[PDB]
Amino acid sequence: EYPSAVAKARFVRVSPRKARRVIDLVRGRSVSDALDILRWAPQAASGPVAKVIASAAANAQNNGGLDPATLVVATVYADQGPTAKRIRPRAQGRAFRIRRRTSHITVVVESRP
Amino acid sequence: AVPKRRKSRSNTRSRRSQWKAAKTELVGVTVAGHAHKVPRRLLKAARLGLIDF
Amino acid sequence: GKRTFQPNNRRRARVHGFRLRMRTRAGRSIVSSRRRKGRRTL
Amino acid sequence: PKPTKGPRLGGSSSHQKAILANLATSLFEHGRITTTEPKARALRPYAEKLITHAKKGALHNRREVLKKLRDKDVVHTLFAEIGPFFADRDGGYTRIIKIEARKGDNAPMAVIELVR
RNA sequence: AAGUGUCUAAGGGCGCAUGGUGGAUGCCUUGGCAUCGAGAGCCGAUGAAGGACGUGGGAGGCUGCGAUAUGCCUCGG
RNA sequence: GAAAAGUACCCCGGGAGGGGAGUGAAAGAGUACCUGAAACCGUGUGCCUACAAUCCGUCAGAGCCUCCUUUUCCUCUCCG
RNA sequence: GGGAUGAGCUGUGGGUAGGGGUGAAAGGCCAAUCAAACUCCGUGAUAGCUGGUUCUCCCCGAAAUGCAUUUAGGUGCAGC
RNA sequence: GGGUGGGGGAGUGAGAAUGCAGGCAUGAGUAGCGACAAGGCAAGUGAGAACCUUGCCCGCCGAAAGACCAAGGGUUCCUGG
RNA sequence: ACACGGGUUCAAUAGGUCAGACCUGGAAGCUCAGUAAUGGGUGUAGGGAACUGGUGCUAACCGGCCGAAAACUU
Asked: Which chain A residues are within 8 Å of B38, Cβ to Cβ?
C-alpha cells in the first residue's frame, strides 16, 4: 500500500526518551513540516532526527524516484541503543554507576496523496 | 523519605506521558528566494533578513 | 592535623627495598615467595 | 528607569549597572547589538534617557551621563552625531527584534537597534 | 413537553504483527585439571634461579637474544 | 565467513551512521558481527475503560473484533 | 574564640612494632577499624544459634505428655 | 549433530540463604552540577559557539588567586593533526 | 509554570516623551565675599522609581492550529 523508504541512525549519543519527546511532534506530518518544526524545536536535540528524516526523503528521491511534496513520515522508532557505564565518586566512598545511553532511530516515509 | 515501593507500570507511563512539548509554527513567511517557514516570534526578524538557514 | 599520606621515595626504598630484605632470613623468603606467585619485586 | 522585580541581572544591582553601561556603550558604538531579551528590555529606559539628555544638549547633562558611562569617546559620538539626528523624534529611540535562541542554553535572544 | 439513547481516549491495560537493547541456551576450541607407563632428578664462584636496561628497516608488548645482541662459528638433518 | 572475497561506485549527512548498488549460498553472518531467549524499551493495530474502590484472579457473562461451518439471500452459478 | 619568646610550632633524617610499642593517663594512638593492628598459614576453625536445602504422583498418619540431665530455646530412652 | 529401546553412572531438576556474576527496570528525565571573585559586546575561524581565538570595557586577589627552589608526579611543556 | 484579567493600530496596555502629585532639599558652571577652609546670588533651583492625566514615536507583527452539520417514542 505504502512502498516506504527506510532510513535510520544507529549509535547516536542522545537518549531514547529525549528523542521521543521530540518525535511525538512529527507523527502523521509531512517531511517539510517536520523539518521546519525541528529547525525551530526549542528542545535542541532534534538535529540528528532532522538529518535522518532528510536522508530518508533524499534516499526516497534518488533510489525510489519519489516527490518530497507528498512524502509523509509514517512510523518513527526511538529504540534503546547500547549503554556504557562510568563511575562517579560521591560522599563517603560510594562508587555510583553512571551511564551514557544511546539510541537507534528508525524512520520510514512514503507518498500519501 | 525514600521510595517505599516501586510504581506500577500503569502509573509510571502516565507520568511519562504528562511531559510533552508545545506546538508553535507559522506558514506563509515569504523571504528572499524560497519561501521558508518560521515562528511568529521571529517572523519580524525573517522579514528583516536576520535569520540563518 | 589533616594529613593522610606523604610519599618520599628515599624513605620507601630504605624501608621496603629488597636490599633491606636481604638483611633478614624472612625477607629473602618474601622475595622467593613473590617469584613463585610470579610478581615483579620491589 | 523603573526598578525591576525579582532577581537583578547577574549578581546584585552593581553588576546590573556594569552590564547596562557596557551594553549601552557598545550599542552606541555599533548600532546593532544581539543579546538576551531581558537585557534589551531593561536597556530601553536606560538608553532612552541617555539620548534624552543628548537631545537636551547640556554640560550638566554630559556629567549626568558620565555618572553612567565612564567611557568618553562614546559620549563624544553620542552628543555629536546621534543626539542631533534623533532631535526630531520625541521618544522611541530604539527597536527590539526577536532573535533565535542560543544552542547551549535556549536563552531568548533579541537584537536591539536604533531607528537608523 | 417528558423519556430511551450508541459515539470521546488526553493517556493507561490485555492480546497479536514487527524492531531494538542484552548475549543466556545449543555447537565448537588458540586452553586447562586429574592419571598409567618411560626418562631426567639437579643448577650455581666457569658467576645459578630470576629480573632491570637495550637490540628488529618500521611506535609498544610477549617469546628469543646481550654492544658480536629476533643473531655469529663447526659437524649433521 | 570455506576463503577478507573487510560492502567498488553513487546519494543524504560536518563526520560517525544509514540507504541504493555489489561480493557472497546467506548481510535475516558487516569489525559494536554464528545461533540471538527473557528482563527491559518502543512502535503499528483488534478490544474494554474518565460515577467509580477490594492480592488486581476465578466462575457466570451481554456486545464488538478475528477465523469458520450451515443458511435467508445476491441467480451475477464453469466463479465468489 | 584560646595560645602565639615558648612545657612552642613545623619540615627534612632516624628509631622503639603487637599480649608488645607509646602515652602531661583517655584504657586513646599504632596507615579511615584498638579492653590488644594487619596479611598469610593452621582453616573448609567452631557454634546446644539464625537463615537456605531445587520435579512430580500414590497409600497410611503423630506429639507438644512423663522420667533424668552444669538441664529447662537442646539432646537420649519411654509413650503416639 | 540428535532420536527409539534394553542397561550403566550423576557436578542432575531453584522461588526465596539482608545469596553470587552479568544486564535492565522503579525512583526519574527528579535531585545535583561543586566557596557569596562576574561577566559583557564586536569582528572572525567554523556546518554548528554564553563556554575556544583576537581586540575594547567591567570586576577580583594582590604578605596571595603573583614570581622562583625541594619532595612528589613522570611528558601532563611546544608544534601539527 | 500554568491559569486569571487587560490590550493587540477604529488602539493610551507596557516602554518612551511633555507637564503634574510626592520625595530629596538649594545641583554644575559662572559671578561676588573670604588668605584659605567655606559662605551668598543666578535658584522652591537641579536630580528622580513605581502613582496621575495628556502625547500614537518604537514595540503589540500585514499570519497559524484546534473547533457543530445532530440514534429514537407518545
From this structure: 36, 40
